[PDB]
């Protein structure tokens, strides 16, 4: 059950690279591709993400995409930069200028076919391809515009594989340009149609977690991406290690997505750790359970008490009592059962995996399909219309051939998605 | 002698089948390589264990089994496990991509591609049968394969073996070990499409097995391995009469005759006693009276429900061990007074009793203690409809919003098959309710 | 913090019980259709006993005993008293009764033509069999016909009939708790055995009455009257027999309804309706499975349900009941 | 309480105790249904491809 990973633009390749660092350390693969681990749980599911090369080396099934060479030379220089298959660096030279239209229609279209060539060569070496995971942001031009172009073309070539994304939402608190709300709205329009599962990673929440909880007065993308790679490691635990469940991307979609358009997940993580400084008291199972449901541990800046949980996945990591985990999970439901829709029975499912993440004895990853996520889309929608009602900054997009109409369509699809979430929060 | 073919489908079915065939081999003295020093008729025989085992000219005793899963993980453990010797590779059928907990993916999309192969392997064992009785089909209600591929297999088996009996052992979904939020959907869909193709079905609710393991085996968080070794004990009580000399439930036809007077209502409750922890050092051995009385305690049933508030249509007692008729009638005498046991007016108030002197066999190193006498009760009581009501309520909750329906429609199923399957369930609950008031 | 749902809005007793629970700060009420409850204050008809006790991580408790209707149905109580060896065909405390349907009663009424003894019965009251049998067929449903107690004990001053309502609570352990406050529900009309069709002094039901307030005389007054008028006590002359009848009925059905080894648990409040004849003999009329309480006693009794049936199972941070020892 | 049909052998015995007397579709249809389902999948998928072509 091979997964093909794609990472696109500056943000997508920065969090992409951290992901492969983190899980590589977990599977005991070193920066040259050689395995130097102790357990065999490490290698039982290694092929979900790694291709095996002659010499018994492990090479990520990862395609690195950008319209600029900058960040990708950074990856290739980074610690684990040499583990990536070099044919899988597909990049242009012009960049995308934080402009969704350039990534999706002009610059990106020039490059997309050679990206699809690498994707095809990766797929054809797969016994049973599950599908794809894309890391990208929605606020720039490459990961946003070209990333959603790739998804639209991958779905045309592989209509029956699962399409999974980690999508970083823009925020004025960690903002590169004023046009981020435009790019994000155009992208959400694509995501609603063409993905099965998207983890909404809100730069607004990562910032607030760094500032309030981690006591970092000046968060950097480094501080944010530490949180992102711990979440990405947590949510993919079930794919990468064996459980009582034989977990894959489609079973996840089947159990998490009751209506096709409502596939935007709130991730959460516990304990929240800042980079570098470790703390030496492992959490207790009661503490993991309480924090991972705490709004302060959510990676989408949405208040879960303002919505209802359609479904929930919880993945505990470490040596712990499965009896006590079952007990604490049953306790949080039965105590706050009003926040779980009553018309999906037993909509909370929990897994435990023996291997903890690096530097923690106990961790818990939360994946929520909450109607509270509409708060994120409302936020971006308000920022969009503030500019769009004055046509501000549109010339950057009409200059690439786009029409106002296409903005009106994307905004209106995103507002329907908001209304569709409110439908089921009252149900 | 008349042969039986066991078919195990999906994860739950395959893993339970492994537990059972392990147990059968210990009970008949067949080693992991299939050699059976006890069979002096080498390469042959019409002995009653040949009902489940064929023999090679080399004297190997091979299960009359086919395992089928839509993904390779589980049957691959059989292919390399301790009993890898037993089975012929042709008996272990695997796909590449499973049903994804989706009834319509197992029945329609994937099912359609493998149903001819499986029935071709099933036909190969039937051709080694001098007089085939029919099939025992093991599967979950909850899986995409268990529910969806089994119901397609059960239709074709009716077509191909019109004259043969089909029995089910069905794992009913429990949230404490459940795999999917849509198991109520799959359960109702597979019941509706399978009902008229199955002559008799023993439902095991994973909730009940799970709580017996916690209460009586003192296992904090039971694993499938704990559940299946207990389940396989119950299956073994139920199949012992097909594999041993005796006069009760001697062919699959007799299960219908003895337990199912009305054909739709073919779901007998199984109750088993005693379940004794193997770590319990000092265990006072339970009497015939005590283990029989325990057959009327809901805490020992394969499905929790209250038979006091239903009616019986039939009841069998299956004992293994030091048991003689006189103790059974004495135990039955005083339980008739002390218990609420109502039969339907058009049925005699009585018990068919079967005693096999070989006491229960327990897997060495497992969780069950060896005991001197055990009993499995099979009772067709309308109180098992409580389980239909629970499932149907959960189905109604989700389906009123049409939650998750798009996953099934996207596999080519029509929304209307949902309300068709539900309406059949509605008629099923109404049948039980007529008989039971 | 325990949880409970309410599924019988028409219940005065449990309208109180839920308000008491909420006001302890340790109970929260859910929506009627939420399955993660500890306690179900359930509906009267078709209560879903088959969906209870399948919530992992939830001790579940309900305020009804499945199977208890066989005691609280006029026709079912008859069949249970005539066919259970524990309650002989002759109970000596149940009035003679038969279940006639409308599409062996005549064998007994004829016996009364032998001695021309009393021959008033009830459903509704009459004196000739035909007058009544035409009434059960005019209604269409199953009625039960019963020997009318032609010589009831009459309270003076007034020459008035009455019945006694006793409230009995049966907890999850099958303890039988008899509330110590009974009520007499008296007829303001002076009894007379000539005109039955004027059933204001015969039917002693509070509604049918649309000396003492509310036509209700509590045990304090009635015991005082028995002392002054008859030289005995309420305990000796009537309450011994009542406790015997309550214990006998509930001990009879205990194997059929007990939830001791069951995956959910029941308690239930019963109202037992009695009738004291002129020799200070106590008779059982009916058993009401969903009884209301007298206004003065709502506070005390609903609090005592919480103490004994609910908090007994779900504890928080001298007594008003007599335990009937079986 | 009446005991009947006592059968004995070396493995055990069986019998019955009375406490009280009383008071399909064809292969070709399967094939239609499956093939109808596969056509509905093909319709849905061609609609997706038509939309992606737009
Ligand atoms: N008692 C018992 N139940 C099992 C076992 N394995 C799975 N189950 C039950 O089966 C249900 C799901 O059906 P499965 O059989 O596991 O799924 P499947 O048959 O492989 O079908 P797929 O969806 O294709 O995987 C779960 O809810 C489990 O409760 C087992 O080994 N023993
Ligand atoms: N055998 C008998 N002899 C004399 N009086 C009798 C009697 N049976 C009943 N009665 C009286 O006549 C009344 C007839 O009403 P019935 O017993 O049908 O009402 P009920 O008890 O069902 C009303 P509720 O449910 O509100 O208590 C009784 O309440 C009692 O006062
Ligand atoms: C309410 C609910 C939620 C999920 C499931 C279910 N069923 N099968 C699978 C799931 C998820 C899952 C969720 C939590 C624990 C274990 C599995 N999952 C998975 C796959 C890939 C991942 O990266 C992470 C998780 C599966 O593979 C059933 C009900
Ligand atoms: N969390 C996080 N967000 C980032 C990072 N880099 C960029 N972003 C976000 O992505 C947006 C810019 O889009 P970007 O991906 O850099 O443009 P691209 O090169 O065309 O893909 C900004 O709003 C940032 O908030 C990063 O390393 N971490
Ligand atoms: Ca032989
Ligand atoms: Mg940038
Ligand atoms: Mg499987």
TrEMBL record, chain C:
Per the record, its GO cellular-component terms are: spindle microtubule
Q: What is its EC number?
A: 6.3.2.25
UniProt xrefs under SUPFAM superfamilies: Glutathione synthetase ATP-binding domain-like
Q: Which GO terms describe its molecular function?
A: ATP binding; tubulin-tyrosine ligase activity
Statement: the UniProt record of this protein carries the keyword Ligase: yes
The UniProt keywords, alphabetically, are:
ATP-binding, Ligase, Magnesium, Nucleotide-binding, Potassium
Required cofactor names: K(+); Mg(2+)
Per its UniProt record, what Pfam families does this chain match?
A: TTL
Q: Which reaction does it catalyse?
A: C-terminal L-alpha-aminoacyl-L-glutamyl-L-glutamyl-[tubulin] + L-tyrosine + ATP = C-terminal L-alpha-aminoacyl-L-glutamyl-L-glutamyl-L-tyrosyl-[tubulin] + ADP + phosphate + H(+)
Q: Kindly list the biological process annotations in GO that this record carries.
A: microtubule cytoskeleton organization
Q: Does the record's keyword annotation contain Magnesium?
A: yes
Family membership noted in the UniProt record: Belongs to the tubulin--tyrosine ligase family.
Give a short account of what the protein does. Answer: Catalyzes the post-translational addition of a tyrosine to the C-terminal end of detyrosinated alpha-tubulin.
Quaternary context: Monomer.
Q: What is this protein called?
A: Tubulin--tyrosine ligase
């Amino acid at each position: 059950r091979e997964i093909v990973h794609i990472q696109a633009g500056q943000c997508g390749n920065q969090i992409g690279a951290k992901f492969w660092e983190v899980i590589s350390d977990e599977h005991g693969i070193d920066p040259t591709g050689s395995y130097h681990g102790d357990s065999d749980l490490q290698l039982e599911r290694i092929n979900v993400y790694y291709n095996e090369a002659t010499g018994n080396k492990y090479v990520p099934r990862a395609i690195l995409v950008d319209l600029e060479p900058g960040t990708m030379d950074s990856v290739r220089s980074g610690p684990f930069g040499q583990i990536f298959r070099p044919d899988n660096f597909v990049f242009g030279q012009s960049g995308a200028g934080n402009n969704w239209a350039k990534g999706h229609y002009t610059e990106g279209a020039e490059l997309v076919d050679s990206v699809l060539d690498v994707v095809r060569k990766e797929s054809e070496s797969c016994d049973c391809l599950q599908g794809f995971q894309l890391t990208h942001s929605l606020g720039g031009g490459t990961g946003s515009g070209m990333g959603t172009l790739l998804i639209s073309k991958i779905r045309e070539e592989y209509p029956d594989r699962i399409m999974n994304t980690f999508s970083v939402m823009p925020s004025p608190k960690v903002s590169d340009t004023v046009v981020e709300p435009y790019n994000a709205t155009l992208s959400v329009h694509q995501l609603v149609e063409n993905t099965d599962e998207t983890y909404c990673i809100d730069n607004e929440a990562l910032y607030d977690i760094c500032f309030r909880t981690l006591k970092l007065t000046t968060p950097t993308y480094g501080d944010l991406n530490h949180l992102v790679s711990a979440t990405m490691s947590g949510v993919t635990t079930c794919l990468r290690f064996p459980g009582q469940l034989n977990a894959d991307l489609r079973k996840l979609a089947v159990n998490m997505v009751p209506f096709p358009r409502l596939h935007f997940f709130m991730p959460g993580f516990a304990p929240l750790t800042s980079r570098g400084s470790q703390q030496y008291r492992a959490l207790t199972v009661p503490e993991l359970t309480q924090q991972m449901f705490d709004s302060k541990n959510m990676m989408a800046a949405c208040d879960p008490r303002h919505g209802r949980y359609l479904t929930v996945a919880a993945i505990f990591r470490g040596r712990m009592s499965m009896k006590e985990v079952d007990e604490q999970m049953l306790n949080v439901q039965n105590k706050n059962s009003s926040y779980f829709v009553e018309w999906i029975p037993n909509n909370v499912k929990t897994a435990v995996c023996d291997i903890p993440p690096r530097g923690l004895k106990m961790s818990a990853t939360f994946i929520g399909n909450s109607t509270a996520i509409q708060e994120l889309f409302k936020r971006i929608s308000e920022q969009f219309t503030a500019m769009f009602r004055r046509k501000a900054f549109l010339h950057w997009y009409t200059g690439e051939g786009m029409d106002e109409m296409e903005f009106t369509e994307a905004e209106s699809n995103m507002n329907d998605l908001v209304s569709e979430y409110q439908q089921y929060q009252d149900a | 002698m008349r042969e039986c073919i066991s078919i195990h489908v999906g994860q739950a079915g395959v893993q339970i089948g492994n537990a059972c065939w392990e147990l059968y081999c210990l009970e008949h003295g067949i080693q992991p390589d299939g050699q059976m020093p006890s069979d002096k008729t080498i390469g042959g025989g019409d002995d009653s264990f040949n009902t489940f085992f064929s023999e090679t000219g080399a004297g190997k005793h091979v299960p009359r089994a086919v395992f089928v899963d839509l993904e390779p993980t589980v049957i691959d453990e059989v292919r390399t496990g301790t009993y890898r010797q037993l089975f012929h590779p042709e008996q272990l059928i695997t796909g590449k991509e499973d049903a994804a907990n989706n009834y319509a993916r197992g029945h329609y999309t994937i099912g359609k591609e493998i149903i001819d192969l499986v029935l071709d392997r099933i036909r190969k064992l039937a051709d080694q049968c001098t007089g085939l009785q029919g099939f025992l089909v093991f599967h979950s209600f909850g899986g995409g394969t268990g529910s969806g591929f089994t119901s397609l297999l059960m239709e074709r088996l009716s077509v191909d073996y019109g004259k043969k009996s089909k029995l089910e052992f069905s794992i009913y979904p429990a949230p404490q070990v459940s795999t999917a939020v849509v198991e109520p959907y799959n359960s109702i869909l597979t019941t509706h499409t399978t009902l008229e193709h199955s002559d008799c079905a023993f439902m095991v609710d994973n909730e009940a097995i799970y709580d017996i393991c916690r209460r009586n085996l003192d296992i904090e968080r039971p694993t499938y391995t704990n559940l299946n070794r207990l389940i396989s004990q119950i299956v073994s009580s139920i199949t012992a009469s097909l594999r041993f000399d005796g006069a009760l439930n001697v062919d699959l036809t007799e299960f219908q005759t003895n337990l199912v007077p009305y054909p739709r209502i073919h779901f007998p409750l199984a109750t088993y006693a005693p379940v004794i922890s193997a770590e319990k050092a000092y265990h006072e051995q339970l009497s015939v009276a005590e283990i029989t009385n325990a057959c009327f305690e809901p805490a020992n049933q394969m499905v929790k429900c209250d038979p006091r508030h239903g009616k019986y249509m039939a009841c069998c007692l299956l004992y293994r061990g030091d048991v003689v008729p006189k103790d059974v009638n004495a135990a039955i005498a005083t339980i008739k007074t002390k218990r609420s046991i109502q039969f339907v007016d058009w049925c005699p108030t009585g018990f068919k009793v079967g005693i096999n002197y070989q006491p229960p066999t327990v897997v060495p190193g497992g969780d069950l203690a060896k005991v001197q006498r055990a009993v499995c009760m099979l009772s067709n009581t309308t109180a098992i409809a409580e389980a239909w009501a629970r499932l149907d309520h959960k189905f109604d909750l989700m389906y009123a919003k049409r939650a998750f329906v798009h996953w099934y429609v996207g596999e080519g199923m029509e929304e209307g098959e949902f309300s068709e399957a539900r309406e059949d369930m509605a008629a099923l609950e109404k049948d039980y309710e007529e008989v039971g008031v | 913090m325990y949880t409970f749902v309410v599924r019988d809005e028409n219940s005065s007793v449990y309208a109180e019980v839920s308000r008491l629970l909420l006001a302890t700060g340790q109970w929260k009420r859910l929506r009627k259709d939420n399955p993660r409850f500890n306690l179900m204050l359930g509906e009267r008809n078709r209560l879903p006993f088959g969906r209870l006790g399948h919530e992992p991580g939830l001790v579940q408790l309900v305020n009804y005993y499945r199977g208890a209707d066989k005691l609280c149905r006029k026709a079912s109580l008859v069949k249970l008293i005539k066919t259970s060896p524990e309650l002989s065909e002759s109970c000596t405390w149940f009035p003679e009764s038969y279940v006639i349907y409308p599409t062996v009663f005549l064998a007994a009424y004829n016996r009364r033509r032998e001695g021309r003894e009393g021959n008033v019965w009830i459903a509704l009251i009459s004196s000739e069999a035909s007058e009544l049998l035409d009434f059960i067929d005019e209604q269409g449903q199953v009625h039960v016909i019963q020997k009318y107690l032609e010589k009831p004990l009459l309270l003076e001053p007034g020459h008035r009939k009455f019945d006694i309502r006793s409230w009995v609570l049966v907890d999850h352990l099958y303890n039988i708790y008899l509330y110590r406050e009974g009520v007499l529900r008296t007829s303001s009309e002076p009894y007379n055995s000539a005109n039955f069709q004027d059933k204001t002094c015969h039917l002693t039901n509070h509604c049918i009455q649309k000396y003492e307030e509310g036509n209700e005389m509590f045990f304090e007054e009635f015991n005082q009257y028995l002392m002054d008028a008859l030289n005995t006590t309420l305990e000796n002359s009537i309450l011994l027999q009542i406790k015997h009848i309550i214990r006998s009925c509930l001990m009879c059905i205990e194997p059929a309804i007990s939830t001791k080894h069951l995956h959910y648990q029941s308690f239930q409040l019963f109202g037992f309706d009695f009738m004291v004849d002129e020799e200070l003999k106590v008779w059982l009329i009916e058993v009401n499975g969903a009884p209301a309480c007298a206004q003065k006693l709502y506070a005390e009794l609903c609090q005592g349900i919480v103490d004994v049936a609910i908090s007994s199972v779900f504890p928080l941070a001298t007594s008003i009941f007599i335990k009937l020892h079986h | 309480m009446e005991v009947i049909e006592l059968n004995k052998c070396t493995s055990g015995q069986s019998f019955e105790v009375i406490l009280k007397p009383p008071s399909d579709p064809s292969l070709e249809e399967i094939q239609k249904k499956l093939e109808a389902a596969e056509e509905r999948r093909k319709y849905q998928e061609a609609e997706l491809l038509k939309h992606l072509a737009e």
